[PDB]
């Protein structure tokens, strides 16, 4: 059984190929949509269902932390809520009122801001 290529829909006869996204590909049919590099071996990210390499992602495909306003590395974990996301860091995801870290705590969101408790939301008007 030769593995089938999910891009060009034909079999791979080379003895080298790439596995990504649960699928097989000719080396040259899994490539950064932005800079065209061969993704094989390398870290990549699915943005709008096209694979991009790590530096293209960092350079034009965002995810900017609501707390510190810096990009969140696509390799590390992050906290999301609705359209928002924060580094999983005591500096980014904490209480707007009292600074209490909220990673894995109960919290209360109000647009961007985020609080540990009703009390804390009730200060901050």
């Amino acid at each position: 059984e030769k593995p089938r290529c999910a891009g060009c829909d034909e079999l791979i006869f080379s003895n080298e190929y790439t596995q990504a996204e649960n699928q097989n590909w000719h080396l040259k049919h899994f490539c950064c949509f932005d800079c065209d590099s061969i993704l094989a071996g390398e870290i990549y990210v699915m943005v709008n269902d096209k694979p991009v390499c790590k530096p293209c992602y960092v350079k034009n495909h965002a995810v900017v932390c609501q707390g510190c306003h810096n990009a969140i590395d696509p390799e590390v974990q992050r906290v999301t809520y609705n359209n928002f996301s924060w580094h999983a860091s005591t500096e980014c995801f904490l209480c707007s009122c009292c600074s209490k870290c909220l990673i894995g705590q109960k919290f209360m969101p109000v647009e961007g801001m985020v609080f540990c408790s009703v009390e804390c939301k009730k200060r901050m008007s």
Partner: peptide, 8 residues
């Protein structure tokens, strides 16, 4: 310099 506002 930047400002990250709490609400729209």
């Amino acid at each position: 310099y930047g400002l990250n506002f709490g609400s729209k």
